[PDB]
Amino acid sequence: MVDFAFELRKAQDTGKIVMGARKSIQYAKMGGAKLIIVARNARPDIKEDIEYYARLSGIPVYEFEGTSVELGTLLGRPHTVSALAVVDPGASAILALGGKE
């Protein structure tokens, strides 16, 4: 399976990720995101909007099985991260989280 923590950090280190719900929605809307990752406990209203804008734009969403505290810690951030957009996967296999289509 895709090693989420590794591939996510490798995309951070070698590609471009944009952090947060607001950026995730923005990049979904203008089609700049390749993949959106959302924390399972993203606040429900925000999550719904992320999921809508992604579906609108045909951007895959992958639900991190972890909290926004865990996701932010994974990304080396001192704050929660409820979602992010993969703008450039770099050298990583992060986009494979999106499925084969």
Numbering used by the authors: 0 to 100
What does the article say, verbatim?
For example, we have shown that the thermophilic ribosomal protein L30e from Thermococcus celer has a ΔCp value of ∼5 kJ mol−1 K−1, which is much smaller than the value of ∼10 kJ mol−1 K−1 obtained for the mesophilic L30e from yeast. To study the contribution of charge-charge interactions to the thermostability and the reduced ΔCp of thermophilic proteins, our group had systematically removed 26 surface charges on T. celer L30e by single charge-to-alanine substitutions. We used the double-mutant cycle to investigate the effect of pair-wise interaction of two salt bridges (E6/R92 and E62/K46) on protein thermostability and ΔCp. Since thermophilic proteins tend to have more salt-bridges than their mesophilic homologs, our observation that salt-bridge reduces ΔCp may provide a general mechanism for enhancing thermostability - thermophilic proteins have more stabilizing salt-bridges that reduce the ΔCp, leading to the up-shifting and broadening of the protein stability curve.
As a negative control, we have also used double-mutant cycles to study the pair-wise interaction between E90 and R92, which have a long separation distance of 10.8 Å. The crystal structures of the E6A/R92A, K46A/E62A, and E90A/R92A variants were determined at resolution ranging from 1.8 to 2.0 Å. The structures of all these variants can be superimposable with the wild-type structures. The root-mean-square deviations (r.m.s.d.) between Cα atoms of the wild-type L30e and its variants were <0.5 Å, suggesting there were no major structural change in these variants. In contrast, the values of ΔΔGint were close to zero for the control pairs (E90/R92). The average values of ΔΔGint for the salt-bridges E6/R92 and E62/K46 were 2.3±0.3 and 3.9±0.3, respectively, while the value for the control pair was 0.6±0.3 kJ mol−1. On the other hand, for the E90A substitution that did not break any salt-bridge, there was no significant change in the value of ΔCp. On the other hand, for E90A substitution that did not break any salt-bridge, the ΔCp value was 4.0±0.1 kJ mol−1 K−1, which was similar to that of wild-type L30e. The values of ΔΔCp(int) for the control cycle, E90A/R92A(M), were close to zero (−0.1 to −0.3 kJ mol−1 K−1). In contrast, the ΔΔCp(int) was close to zero for the control cycle E90A/R92A (−0.2±0.4 kJ mol−1 K−1).
